Amino acid sequence: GAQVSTQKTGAHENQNVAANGSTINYTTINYYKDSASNSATRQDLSQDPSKFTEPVKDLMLKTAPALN
Amino acid sequence: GAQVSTQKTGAHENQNVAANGSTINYTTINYYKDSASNSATRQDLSQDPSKFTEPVKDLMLKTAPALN
Amino acid sequence: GAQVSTQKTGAHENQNVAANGSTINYTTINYYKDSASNSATRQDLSQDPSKFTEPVKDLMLKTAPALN
Amino acid sequence: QPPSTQSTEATSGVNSQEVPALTAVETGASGQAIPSDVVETRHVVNYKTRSESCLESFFGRAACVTILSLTNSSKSGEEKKHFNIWNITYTDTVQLRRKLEFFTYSRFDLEMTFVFTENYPSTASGEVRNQVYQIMYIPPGAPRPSSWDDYTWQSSSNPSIFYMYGNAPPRMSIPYVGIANAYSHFYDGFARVPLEGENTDAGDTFYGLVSINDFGVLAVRAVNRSNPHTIHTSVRVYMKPKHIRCWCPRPPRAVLYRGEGVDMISSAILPLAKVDSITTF
Amino acid sequence: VSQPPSTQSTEATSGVNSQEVPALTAVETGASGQAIPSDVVETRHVVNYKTRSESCLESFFGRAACVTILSLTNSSKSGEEKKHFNIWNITYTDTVQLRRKLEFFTYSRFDLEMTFVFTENYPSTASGEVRNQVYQIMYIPPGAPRPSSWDDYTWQSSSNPSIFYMYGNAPPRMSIPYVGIANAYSHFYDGFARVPLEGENTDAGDTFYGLVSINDFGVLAVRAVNRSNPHTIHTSVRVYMKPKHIRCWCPRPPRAVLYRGEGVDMISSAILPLAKVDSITTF
Amino acid sequence: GLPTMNTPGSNQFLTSDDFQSPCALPNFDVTPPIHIPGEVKNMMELAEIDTLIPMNAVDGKVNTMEMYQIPLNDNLSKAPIFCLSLSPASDKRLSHTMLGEILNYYTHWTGSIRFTFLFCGSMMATGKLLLSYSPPGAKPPTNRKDAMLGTHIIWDLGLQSSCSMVAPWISNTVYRRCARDDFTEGGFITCFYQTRIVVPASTPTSMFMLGFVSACPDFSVRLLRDTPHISQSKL
Amino acid sequence: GLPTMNTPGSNQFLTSDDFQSPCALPNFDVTPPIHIPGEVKNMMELAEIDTLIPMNAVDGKVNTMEMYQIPLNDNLSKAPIFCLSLSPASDKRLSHTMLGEILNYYTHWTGSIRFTFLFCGSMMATGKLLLSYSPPGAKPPTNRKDAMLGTHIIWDLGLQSSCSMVAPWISNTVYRRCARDDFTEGGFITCFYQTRIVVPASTPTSMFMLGFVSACPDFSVRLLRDTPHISQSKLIGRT
Amino acid sequence: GLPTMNTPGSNQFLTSDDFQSPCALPNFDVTPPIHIPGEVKNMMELAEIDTLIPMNAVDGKVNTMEMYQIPLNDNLSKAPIFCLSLSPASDKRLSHTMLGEILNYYTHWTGSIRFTFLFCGSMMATGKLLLSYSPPGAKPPTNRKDAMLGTHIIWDLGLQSSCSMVAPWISNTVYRRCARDDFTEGGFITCFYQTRIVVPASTPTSMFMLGFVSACPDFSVRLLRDTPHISQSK
Amino acid sequence: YSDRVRQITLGNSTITTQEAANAIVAYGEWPTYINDSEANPVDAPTEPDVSSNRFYTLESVSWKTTSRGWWWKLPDCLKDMGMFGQNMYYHYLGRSGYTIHVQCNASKFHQGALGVFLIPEFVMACNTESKTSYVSYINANPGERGGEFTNTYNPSNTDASEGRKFAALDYLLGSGVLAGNAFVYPHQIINLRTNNSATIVVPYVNSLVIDCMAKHNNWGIVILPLAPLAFAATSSPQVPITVTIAPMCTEFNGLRNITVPVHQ
Ligand SMILES: CCCCCCCCCCCCCC(=O)O
Ligand SMILES: CCCCCCCCCCCCCC(=O)O
16 A cells, blocks of 8 residues: 655656656655654645735735835 | 565576576665665666766777778 | 566475465565575476487387397 | 667778878867777677766765774773864875865765774773764864863764664765865865965965865763773764766876875886887887 | 466377487487487376576576685784685685685676675683774775784775674675676686797796696785784684675586695596495486 | 665575676676587486496495496395495495585485396406395395385396486485485385396406496485585684 | 574674765755766776876886886897786886786786887988787797787878777786786787887987887676775774 | 664764654644744854844944944045954954854855945935945055955935945855964955045034945855854863 | 868857867867756756857977976966956856867977877866965966976975975876876877867856856867977977966856956
């Protein structure tokens, strides 16, 4: 019941696409009943900066004057 | 998610054709998230010495006078 | 990419191959890319003593006078 | 199947206007002649290969790159010897740097293995408990510990290895970490450009790759408190490049190295042996 | 998954009053006699399930043997510095039992397993505390530099292979691929490394003959890793080797007498290997 | 990561071990094989080759070339020419033969054993010999009459000079020991005349015979052991 | 839970080890590759480059630039102009060429070797040179007569300023040792004038030739070793 | 049972390890998650937030509120009125901003940096300022002329009370060290008056500007490291 | 269409010869502009075109029969060369490939040979012994004038003034590396017997796609008198050697106030 994922690239690896070669492949099995025992999660690169940098109720555009 | 490949031959092996017996195969699984943690890569034996031994814009044939 | 083959028989076997079902099978995996690292080969019981015991040009027959 | 070296084809006598044996070295090209062009040859079949000399194989072994010295001191002095901070480099070792220096540029992942060994250097031998060591990497820009018991050994970000003596030699993989796409073995330049208003004495270590090499330091300490009976521990650091590509090949140094760069010692300017004559075989 | 071959089975027979008499077979021809019981006596039919597995060459040569013993010493005394460094050529001159088995063949091709067994003792009357030792073994192929001492630069081993062993862990092991420059190792060499000529000395080559003159696979170097302790400690290193994946050519008889030296030299004191009996008719 | 348990037998060094290990010289390509004649695949192929039996190793004829020469004559005798214990491993003369030497690396053995005799007399010599094998556990062969209560061949000397007898595999056991003990009694092989050797006037009166021993095709060996014939000074 | 047995070789450090290991710096973002000119994939690609032979290693030439200059003259002499033992990683003259330096890291080697000669005399100069190679037996030639009884080429000096000779792979073995060894001795290379160099008025009577050596395409090496060509004082740990 | 070999690195503790381990509290019920507001997934989300630059580093304005207040006058001047060394992590003025502090946990960094300014003078006052970035390896921008040669914008004071200058990622290296590496010189950020501030009668003639620093969207960091800004007793 | 005759046309200047060896393209690669896929800076680039990609001549040197060689650094030589030189001081970053054409005329009665070698990252040793890697900016970068090699080593262990210089030994190539292996580097040889010129096309080579020319010399050039110059006359005639260089596919990034380096 192993899961697999793409390994992060290294010195002799392919381009940043990481799509070239089935050989880039880390395989893992969880051995414990509590998921707290599992290794760390997959990188989550999802980002949402607007929450902190642009939490404006009004719709603000960058080209529009900020004021008006 | 194992990789399977051919081993380098030894004393009791075939005609160094690796097309005689399946007993020359071996397996491996990557166990770490970064590819830098993997084993050394499969050897790329492609070579192109001409870039260092005959880097000449206007190609000479070896039997041609080098200089006409 | 494992190999599966039979075992040399032991005390509780009927000495026939596959007459002991799956009892006598074993699994072996090569873990190295270099065949020098492999464990010993399958016994090769093939042999031909005539190379040393009857190395003759004129075929000898057992019942013929050797010196025909 | 893997490629083999080329086979030689069978040949016979030749009488033609072809000149494979003649050339013009001046072009910068190497000669191209092979035995089949110059002498009668037989057909041979070459199953021999060149994997043994591929770059991954050439650079396929770990080498000792430095020696660190750690001491557990029961004396009022030498507390400072409980830890050792070394600049990370491979230039302390001549065999390894010479191999790497075959190329102007290189790109590789690196793995490190350490070997610990220790003795009891004093005449007053006695019981010492099994010791544990911490290998901490201190990245460039990170603070250095002032002491083996300095708070920076907390290692909240700095990665480290805790090794108990007697277990398998500790080991870790390091990814390529250059800020360039390739590591530079040589650098004909200066870290900073002196400008017109500056003093004409404008050397002061700015010249050479050394001045632009900051890969942090490796800080190793015993992790215990002093024991009445002291210990001298020698740590040998091993390095092996992995997944390596190189570019722009260059000839190796024939003389002993002087320091970090390519500086020469006057005592080793004459690397080759003499012979009795041109005509001695 | 198939039934392995067994040794020859026996058919039932009866006496034969005929002109076919295989019992009377010549050996003058170079052939061995081939008669089996069914040729000379009345026999019982017997099904044969016996297998010649231990006699296959892989099994015959399938066990590790001690090859040599090296003496390595760790001491604070300055006169002992040279004893922390031990150089040994690989040869099976040092081990009768293995040499003899290899000799059954003229040539052989195999991969070789090496295992190292280290044992510590105090060689003197000293017995205070010392620290656990680490040992380094590096192989130095012909032409590679040799260390001058136990503590030297060549120990960097950048291109030479090596093993670092912590005392008390499992004996270290490594596999060596076939390393001949021939298509088989020669067990014997009836020749000289070079041919003397053009009127040079007629005694030329007297000390440069036989397999030893062409046999050089490199040397094994073992060294203490630790700095010296006040209490001298000595380590005996037993080097074991086991050929595997082995093929051999051209049988030879085993040596019947006490070996002496590397080659086939006899020792004058022990050239009478056969025991005497009281009579040709003793039984 | 993966929970495991170290069982007994862990981290031990066994000389009969068959585990895999890292290559010290990884990716070394092996020098290509060539065909070499005389390939040996099994030690039995050598055990099956006729080798001389050092039968006359008596009174100074020991460790000399004459050691393999069995004397024969034209006199009257009812006595044996020679006698061998069958045990190929314990008989002092059979042990030091190719068969005995291969065999001495083993503890157990089984199968039939072939004994071949070559007469090296004059062409003008005639006569007949009685060669026999007497299974164990009874009065030994002694004279020429008791010796016929067993397997025998009558060898009529002629142009096909060489002949052989096979001491058939007769045992209570499946295998016999190579080691000497009282239980593993091999039985006996002896030879005596049917008739004296007869020659014409002015020809040799004495002759020699060469005996050979070899394994039969049904022969096998089992467990390996160190060979007692090899020795060395302490290292 | 899964029962296991540790084999011999367990918990040892092998410098030849190719086992996987934890990354000290997880999730590190590696600087992307770019194209860099001159990628080298195999060391043999450098072995195939023709480099100079420091043949003139006699006292006073040794360790200076003249070391690479093979003297030539218009004087008539049957004497050889040069001689080399064909032992590419042993001969004092060859062990430091690029081919020798690569081979100094190898224990065993094989395949043909090419020798290229460049004449640097004036355009006005002419003549003929005999290059010759013989297998490692009999005697080194000390006479053109014997040099002819072997593999040889006669080079017409002319507009094609250079020529080459290849010492074919003639050996009893598959691989020769790099280490000096009588058993594996590689043979002899010599050169004699076939025709003296002919010099017209106002042309110098002495000339130099530059000899070069390189690996041929069938060339290979077996086994890595450390080089006895670089050293250092013993390293002592910082304290 | 199953033959195995322990490799180098066995039985060691690495602080960077990512291995599974048995749970000390088996079958524990983890209090269910709720939609807690303000989730942060990445540190760069904080790097992009504009924070103030403690520019007024002159002794007496250090470690006080005035530290972030940059004085301006209507007095005619051709003097520089602002001098940053850019290195977000090593510049004494930037290392304590949030961007600088985040970078003090990293060894290397890349991407463009944005500098935003806010004029807090009277509504009545107007004028123009020159905001400029000059690449490294050059004489510092001694005067307005040099500032004009480099990358710059003119901020025309009006209703849009703020402006942003961007110092693009011009670097020979892909990444620069966070450390004070003379090799990876930051370059220079400066400011000159484009024109004297025009101040009508009966208003303040001395006013303040606030400056902010933040990461641009092409910004990133590499290896994690200990920050030198915190310490403790043993 | 013989190989001996060439015409090189870059920018607004043409170099021709009736005698040449076919040009070398180091590593088989021509200089190109940086592709979007491998760019570092975001600044729209300066592409001088003809303003930079034209030939400039370095001051000629004389080849004496006692010479041990000459050296130059490529981007350093062109530092004062018209617009190329100005762009170097105006921008932080810049990149260029090069075309190098070397000539040396001689009579049919002259003999000798000059190797022309291009060394990416040509790093020379400090001539001080004393403290390591002590080289001044001024002496490191001589301009089109270049510098030379000697056949003796005399590090100035007691004086920095001769120490700020390179230990330009000819037989160790200024680095400890034997000259006989100089041939590893892309090279062409001018053999006065036949060939009177050499041409080498030089790609940009670095670990970076672009770098600062004021800090780093990507390539150096060495001219080595591999075979001695000779002529029957005892006058031991000197012959000129002229090195002519054009940058190729030049681009610059990071426009800044113009700089001036520390001067002599
Ligand atoms: C946790 C340990 C991290 C160690 C990081 C440094 C890795 C090696 C850096 C490259 C060595 C210098 C190469 C060169 O000279 O171009
Ligand atoms: C890293 C250790 C390398 C060891 C290389 C030596 C291997 C054994 C060489 C062959 C010795 C002769 C064998 C034979 O007699 O059949």
